[PDB]
Amino acid sequence: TTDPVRMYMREMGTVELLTREGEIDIAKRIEDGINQVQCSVAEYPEAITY
Amino acid sequence: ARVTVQDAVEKIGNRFDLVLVAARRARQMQVGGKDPLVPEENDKTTVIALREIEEGLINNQILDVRERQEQQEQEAAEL
Amino acid sequence: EFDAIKIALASPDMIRSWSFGEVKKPETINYRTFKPERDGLFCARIFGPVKDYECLCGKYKRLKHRGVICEKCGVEVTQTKVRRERMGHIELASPTAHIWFLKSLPSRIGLLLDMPLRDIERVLYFESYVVIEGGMTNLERQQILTEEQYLDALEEFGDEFDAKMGAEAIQALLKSMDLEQECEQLREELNETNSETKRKKLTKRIKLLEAFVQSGNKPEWMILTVLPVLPPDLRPLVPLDGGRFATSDLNDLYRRVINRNNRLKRLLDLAAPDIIVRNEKRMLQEAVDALLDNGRRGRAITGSNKRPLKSLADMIKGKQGRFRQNLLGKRVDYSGRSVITVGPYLRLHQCGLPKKMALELFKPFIYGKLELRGLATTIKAAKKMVEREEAVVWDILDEVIREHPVLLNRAPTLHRLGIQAFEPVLIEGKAIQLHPLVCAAYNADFDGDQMAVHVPLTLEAQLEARALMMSTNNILSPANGEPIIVPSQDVVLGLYYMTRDCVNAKGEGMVLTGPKEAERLYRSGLASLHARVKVRITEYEKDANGELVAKTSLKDTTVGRAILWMIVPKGLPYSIVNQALGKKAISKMLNTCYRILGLKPTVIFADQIMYTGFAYAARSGASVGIDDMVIPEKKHEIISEAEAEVAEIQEQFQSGLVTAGERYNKVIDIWAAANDRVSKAMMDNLQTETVINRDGQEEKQVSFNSIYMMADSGARGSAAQIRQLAGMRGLMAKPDGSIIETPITANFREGLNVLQYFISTHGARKGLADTALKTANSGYLTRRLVDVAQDLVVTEDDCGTHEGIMMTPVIEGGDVKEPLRDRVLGRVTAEDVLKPGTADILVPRNTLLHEQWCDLLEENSVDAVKVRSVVSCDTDFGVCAHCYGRDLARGHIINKGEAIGVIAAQSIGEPGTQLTSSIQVKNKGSIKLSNVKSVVNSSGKLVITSRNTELKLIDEFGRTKESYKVPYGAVLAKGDGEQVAGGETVANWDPHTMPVITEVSGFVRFTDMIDGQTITRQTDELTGLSSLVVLDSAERTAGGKDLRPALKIVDAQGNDVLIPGTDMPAQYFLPGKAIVQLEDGVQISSGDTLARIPQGLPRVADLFEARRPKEPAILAEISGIVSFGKETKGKRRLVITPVDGSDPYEEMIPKWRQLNVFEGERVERGDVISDGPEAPHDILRLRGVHAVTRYIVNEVQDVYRLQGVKINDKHIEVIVRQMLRKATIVNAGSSDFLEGEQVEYSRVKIANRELEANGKVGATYSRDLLGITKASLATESFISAASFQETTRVLTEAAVAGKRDELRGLKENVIVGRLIPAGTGYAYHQDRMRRRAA
Amino acid sequence: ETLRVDPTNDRLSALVEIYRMMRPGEPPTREAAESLFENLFFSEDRYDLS
């Protein structure tokens, strides 16, 4: 059957739930990402002077 | 009056060319380029056209000759 | 203005070329003030201004500008009709499959990529992957994957690999494909390899490919990139009264599409995860596919409503689409509608019409005459003058009516006499008065039915309605030459009362000088209306050449006949009024008057008949009453006798003597016998009951009962209904279709009790339900028949061919059902026909046969005539007039131009409402046997070895009075050519016993007959002759399973008896239950049995549709010796051995079923191999086109003449022509086509006659019959294939093909609104065709 | 004969077959299937003969 809401449910049904600590772990990965892009800004002097 | 169109079918055949010929003739009598060649009995130009067909003095050939004659008189009336 | 309509695909560059704006926002209009929102679905700079020549802001309000655009807000200041015209577009972010090229049954993306549709939907719904030209490493091109297989292929091959998913993948597939390389590939696969059904699918795909490349299309246009939008005034959002709006649901659809497109652009801005954008691309696919054609998904419903909304293909396709609701039939101004009524004071060229309708219809004519005559200074004054209805306008209206025909129309307009013109006579009243004789043409009774008037505005339409559609022109049906202005009910009663004779009346046997003193005697009251009287009448006749020869005499007639004689015109003889003049007789009277004196005396004669019929029906006082239905004194006696006989059968069933079924059959036979005795009692108690006296004792005569006159005149009803009023009424049938053993022994003059009436109610309700359903199906049959045959127009004057079919009379088993005369009357001869003395030319080769020529046919002894038929004509794109015939409202030959397909299909489908041993020779003559091969037996009789024998009873005049399909192996008493007598059973076959008769005479033996296996030993109780008889397939053992029992002959010497004349013996193979009566070494004679083998309207819509019959008659392909092959597969191999040609044909026959031929015989091509119905395909493919058109016309004329409805055969023949236009070519040759390609017969014919006129070889074809719902869509003109049937498949099939439509045949010209190339417009199209490209 | 046609053997595969054959396309679950077959013919709410 086509019923693309059900195809959406089956496409997302493979992704499983998170524990209450895995959210903090993903948030710390987000912190690592913004940390590394701000440290990438930290080497570039023209953005600083801008 | 004109109840059946049978005599006009006997003069002009094909029963469909009759409509076109009578239409052209009745336009020649309604738009005032001409005037009837038969006495009218307070008929409309339809019935007068069919009566001019039944008297034999109108068909496609006579209308073509008369129309070319009017065109030749226009060419003579250019001056 | 323009020529042929072209259709193709839409490139995104083409779509940006159409559109005058991108619709970026889903708003429609501003809510507070209702100005349109920029730039929503209703915009200004995209589509147009709201008001006539005015910007939206107001900077440009007048005609000071028309070219400018306002720079505050974009408005191109023009007419607002431009807003009806300019289109928009939507830039779709992700591409999207077009649902019409995805979900129609011959799917185009499906068999263009050669990929199954479920995998394509699996790609488009992001469930899988597909490789897109991913090189050659491990993965093929069309090889799909899954996600895990995609990770497999990516980790195993990191690069040189390409596989997307969704609409991008299908678009890359269609873009990547090189077409002509695969064209070469499939041509090689169709040259060397042969995989029959699969290569038929393959040659269909290569037909699609080389049709696609021949067009100007690209495949990736089947995926939408930029979606066009419709103009606003086609999807309007207009105010109703009350501040509430009506939107069309296309606004919902475009709002949803624009909304999800903006959402997908917004998601791809924010770099969404893959699950979300795959969700959104599936949603945008669903939104577009719901906009293009909602209903091929889960049926996305609208808001605040459960009802499913209406998409674009809902607006094209169907009963409510533009093709059938607003193009083929339009609602029309200058029309009116009111209840109809009689008004018998009219001549039939005129009808009544009300003054109020005549004022409302003819308003602009009255306006014109009033401003011409100066009574109204301006036209508003003319409006107020005709509004107040002042006394001066009625003379004006009488001037504008006088010679102006109106069109009268009844709503079921089946045949072409439903629209007729009249001249109006103004009526004080509100009901259209309609002339009575015309009403039988309309099928209009006056029980409240209401009719519609239309007004020819222009001058040509007035001349059309007078010359073609005036009521005095249509006095002959287009279905047959019978009069359709037949006098119907009161007038025939007035006649049948007027022309009759009672044995004693006033003025009995006096003498009269003419009709005038007949009228003076009747109207003074001295002599009665009907008394036998010698009068002097003067009849004229056409003896010389159009000359009225007068003869006068004293005819012995009645008074009323003489009074009617004043009304007969000059030409007719007196014998037309000397009989009783029922309905049949008065129809023959009008028919003879038309076929002699032409049109004008017949019209004025029909008017005078109607007047005198109504007048003397008023003078008749013919009145029904309760004493007018005489009950027989013999009624209750016969009912009591039958009530004793059913008690006899009741006692015989309670005695256990009979079973139930034979009891039931005996009881129903004796009740039918009692009903027949009651009918023959009541008829003799009605019709001769009047017995009176003159100059003697007594004398009987026909009765002056009221109901007998109303049944004998044929006015209303016949003796079935008179039977149900006087005698017992019938035997009713229960809802089973079973029929009750206790019939209704009470008529309506007596009472019916509750149970009898309750039983009768079921028959009444079944009748009503059947009339409703048959009305619907007859409408559908008419529609299919006209839509298969509007393209056919009489176009050429003559083709000059020698083709034709063979008209013979249709006698079959009984007497004549339709003679030779009224079949061939009206047609034309192909070759000259000759007298029974040969080399005597009675007609030349091609003359129009009229009634004197059929008189010349009947004065001689002709029986069969070759006739030019329209199904075998030679003309391109029509039927030449000299081949068609003559039958029309006129009597002459058909004119060049007039559409006959439409009149033919109407005359077939119009009576669709009305639709539902041994030889016992009757007549005497001589005997003839065609295709007979027989042998004299020992008993002096004659046994027949050929089953094609046709028995003809030929009298002294050569014609055939009876024919009998002679069964195989009958016992003839007389031979051939001997004069036979009536009642003499010549051939007496055994119909329960299939004969195994021979030509030989000798000792019957057993060959390959093993006891206990192929044959059992039976010892008879009755006869006692024990024998070895062949058994069934279950009991015959594995040795003798395939081994068959055979019978063969020797003489006294032991040598094998050969057939006298040939060298083959008679070795015959017996089936199961074939009883061996005569054993080994037993003498027989010539032809003795070696053994014995004991035991409505949807018919028409099956014939013209030509559906395959359930049990087909099997027929031999080529003529040759029949033989058997292998045994016991469920089938057997039927092998043919032609003498000259190459033999090796064999056909699978399911060998359980009884065959016809024996193995020793020989069959002709097209001869039957078994019995039952046969497909028209077989008859066309084997016998010939003449045979299949004869088969259709004889079968459907059996179906019509069962009801007793006459339809001339021209109409059925031209529908047969329109069936078989397509024909597949076998040998290509010098032509361009293919070995399996289906192209129309007229197109290959003009190709060959260009090549065959040259020295090259032509293209041989195979004619192929198609049904009416399939020969109408397989057409070279797609609007005639899209106007009625399945629309989506036709538009997509003609959109992938780039097909060009040249308007070709009256459907497109009704669609596009120009003249019709059949009627008066034929001269216009001929002038244009002479002008066009010359 | 009907048992020889039938694929399933026990109660749970029967409920899984019904729950897969009423809401197709989605994977089944034991207690949801039990509540479904409860709510088809044997619940007082969604099924009623008067």
Ligand SMILES: [Mg+2]
């Ligand atoms: Mg009615």
Ligand SMILES: [Zn+2]
């Ligand atoms: Zn503006």
Ligand SMILES: [Zn+2]
């Ligand atoms: Zn022809």
